[PDB]
A paper describes a structure:
Here, we report phylogenetic analyses, combined with the selection and characterisation of five fungal AA7s, three of which belong to previously unexplored clades. We determined the crystal structures of FgChi7B and FgCelDH7C at resolutions of 2.4 and 1.6 Å, respectively. Both enzymes share the canonical AA7 fold comprising an FAD-binding F domain and a substrate-binding S domain that is formed by a central β-sheet flanked by α-helices. Moreover, the two enzymes share an aromatic cluster comprising: (i) the catalytic base tyrosine (FgCelDH7C Y454), (ii) a tyrosine/phenylalanine (FgCelDH7C F99) that stacks onto and stabilises the catalytic base, and (iii) an aromatic residue that stacks mainly onto the saccharide unit penultimate to the reducing end (FgCelDH7C F383).
The selected fungal sequences share 25–39% amino acid sequence identity and originate from Aspergillus nidulans (AnAA7A, clade I), Fusarium graminearum (FgCelDH7C, clade IIa and FgChi7B, clade Va), Magnaporthe oryzae (MoChi7A, clade Vb) and Polyporus brumalis (PbChi7A, clade VI). FgChi7B (clade Va), MoChi7A (clade Vb) and PbChi7A (clade VI) displayed the highest normalised rates (Vo/E) on chitooligosaccharides, followed by N-acetyl glucosamine (GlcNAc). The KM values of MoChi7A and PbChi7A towards GlcNAc were about 20-fold lower compared to FgChi7B, highlighting a marked difference in affinity for monosaccharides between these enzymes. All previously characterised AA7 oxidases are distinguished by a cysteinyl and histidyl bi-covalently tethered FAD cofactor. Thus, the isoalloxazine ring of the FAD cofactor in FgChi7B is bi-covalently anchored at the C6 atom to C162 Sγ (6-S-cysteinyl) and the 8α-methyl group to H102 Nδ1 (8α-N1-histidyl), akin to all previously determined AA7 structures.
Residue numbers in the entry: 31 to 505
């Protein structure tokens, strides 16, 4: 069957990786080493036509098919979340092209750092995206794309124009608001479930020349954390849009860190109200170029990431997309966390990232259709949320994997217990792997689910493009 496929692929001269070869062992290695899988075949296209033929060779052999770009799926859904998929690795298609009207064409395999590197050097242009340079553009944008430029310039999908996409029947479409309003609407948030994208289009913004990263180091106690976090909610509503912030919380201390697109002295005035509530001061702050800021937050990884790519970790993570927590909700989180922090025996191999996500001064909250003053056509449901939580654990998962799952869930639940069941969601790019399809799609996609399920039945009724937390077609 792996050879039933592999033969079809080479009948259409779709480049494929030979089974159980040296390259097959290097390509089947997931990013998250905790979850590995074994394709039925791996395709390695370099043209849109390869993808189309590869998708047709998938329909022929009744295999589910799944696309992998960067491979940073927290559950290795690039491979399909299971064995026996045809896996179309678009990593080799990474050409960036900057047009004169400031739109760009980015092939579906480009990694974020290769996108910023080529956009700043082809002109001085950029799109908003996350901090990790090795992340693939396809998975990042089709589900959101948040980083230290988002509060100022929006999610990556907010700048999304359209994409050449291969539907389950092999037909190649260019999807944009005019020609395919609903398909493009699904691609802005949940496009992993609807086709194999080969090229994405975005409207770039001018890479700023004056950018100030900053950190504020802290060591809260439980009650200094109920106050400090409540003070940050208020600041998330009022701070200028030039300001981008998150707070790392770990087992031994905290660090408020972010980026202000402006001068140091202006950052000082923006932070004054929050630092007053906190009783804290900037620890490190420096002004420099835009590529400098992306390198400072790349976590040691060189920006211009390309193929071949061999980064790996073994971890479990989850997220939250909350509104402003109440006093008592922040107290439940800090009681449960410092309960863990002060316990010498408990699992301490975790950390938490709380981005300031929405509010009146965030560009995500009222993102618009490009070149318009009308709302954006996007299935992404969380523009009304204020805070983007991420819970991670990078400890042991061979022998004590269920301790890793318990501790992050105990943290996440401590936040949501008192919250109205439909006032909080979760973030698909930070997908919680332990979730039932019903729960996951409820939380990632919210009130877009029915329209998404209606559209899934239109386009992929046999559910070829399958993954554990994918959109299921309506019966
Ligand atoms: C590993 C990692 C992930 C990060 C990091 N930093 C982030 C940040 O600062 N902000 C964020 O908002 N997210 C951050 N993420 C998470 C990434 O955004 C997500 O993990 C991306 O979804 C991963 O994308 P990619 O690198 O392409 O991973 P894949 O496993 O290849 O794909 C995931 C998902 O997308 C589908 N898909 C991929 N390629 C296609 C194409 N061409 N067409 C359709 N669908 C595609 C896959 O099927 C799968 O469902 C920091 C780090 C270190
Ligand atoms: C592969 O599948 C896609 C999606 O299932 C097919 O595209 C869809 O095709 C229909 C008809 O060709 C398009 O027309 C739509 O339906 C009504 C029917 O009355 C038509 O009058 C309208 O023009 C309306 O647009 C539809 O738009 C189109 N959808 C998409 C997303 O492309 C495609 O035809 C299939 N490929 C092959 C080779 O059959």
């Amino acid at each position: 069957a792996p050879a039933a496929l592999n033969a079809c692929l080479a009948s259409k001269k779709v480049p494929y990786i030979p089974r159980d070869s040296a390259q097959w062992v290097k390509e089947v290695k997931p990013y998250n080493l905790r979850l590995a899988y074994t394709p039925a075949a791996i395709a390695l296209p370099t043209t849109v036509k390869h993808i189309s033929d590869a998708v047709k060779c998938g329909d022929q052999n009744k295999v589910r098919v799944s696309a992998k770009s960067g491979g940073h799926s927290y559950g290795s859904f690039g491979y399909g979340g299971e064995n026996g998929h045809l896996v179309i690795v678009v990593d080799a298609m990474d050409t960036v092209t900057l047009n004169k009207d400031m739109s760009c064409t980015v092939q579906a395999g480009a990694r974020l750092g290769h996108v910023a590197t080529d956009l700043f050097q082809f002109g001085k242009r950029a799109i908003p995206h996350g901090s990790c340079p090795g992340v693939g553009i396809a998975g990042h944008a089709l589900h959101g794309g948040y980083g230290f430029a988002s509060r100022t310039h929006g999610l990556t999908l907010d700048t999304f124009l359209g994409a050449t996409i291969v539907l389950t029947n092999g037909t190649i479409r260019y999807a944009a608001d005019w020609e395919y309003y609903d398909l493009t609407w699904a691609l802005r948030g949940a496009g992993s479930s609807f086709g194999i994208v080969a090229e994405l289009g975005f409207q770039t913004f001018a890479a700023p020349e004056t950018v100030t990263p900053f950190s504020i180091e802290l060591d809260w106690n439980e009650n200094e954390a109920v106050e400090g976090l409540l003070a940050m909610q208020k600041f998330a509503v009022t701070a200028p849009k030039e300001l981008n912030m998150q707070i790392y919380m770990g087992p031994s201390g905290q660090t408020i860190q972010g980026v202000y697109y402006g001068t140091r002295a202006n950052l000082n005035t923006a932070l004054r109200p929050l630092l007053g509530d906190l009783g804290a001061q900037i620890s490190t702050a420096s002004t420099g170029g835009w590529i400098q800021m992306l390198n400072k937050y790349a976590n040691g990884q060189a920006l211009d990431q390309r193929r071949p790519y061999d980064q790996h970790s073994t971890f479990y993570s989850t997220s939250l997309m909350t509104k402003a927590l109440t006093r008592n909700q922040v107290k439940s989180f800090a009681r449960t966390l410092f309960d863990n922090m002060n316990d010498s025996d408990a699992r301490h191999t975790w950390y938490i990232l709380i981005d300031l996500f929405g509010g009146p001064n965030s560009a995500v909250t009222n993102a618009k259709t490009l070149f318009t003053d009308l709302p954006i056509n996007s299935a992404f449901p969380h523009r009304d949320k204020l805070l983007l939580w991420q819970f991670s654990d990078h400890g042991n998962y061979a022998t004590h994997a269920n301790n890793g799952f318990t501790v992050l869930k105990r943290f996440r639940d401590s936040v949501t217990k008192t919250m109205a069941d439909g006032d909080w969601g979760m973030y698909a790019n930070y997908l919680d792997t332990q979730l039932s399809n019903e729960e996951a799609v409820k939380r990632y996609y919210g009130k877009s689910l029915p329209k998404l399920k209606k559209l899934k039945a239109e386009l992929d009724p046999k559910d070829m493009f399958w993954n554990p937390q994918g959109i299921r077609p309506a019966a």
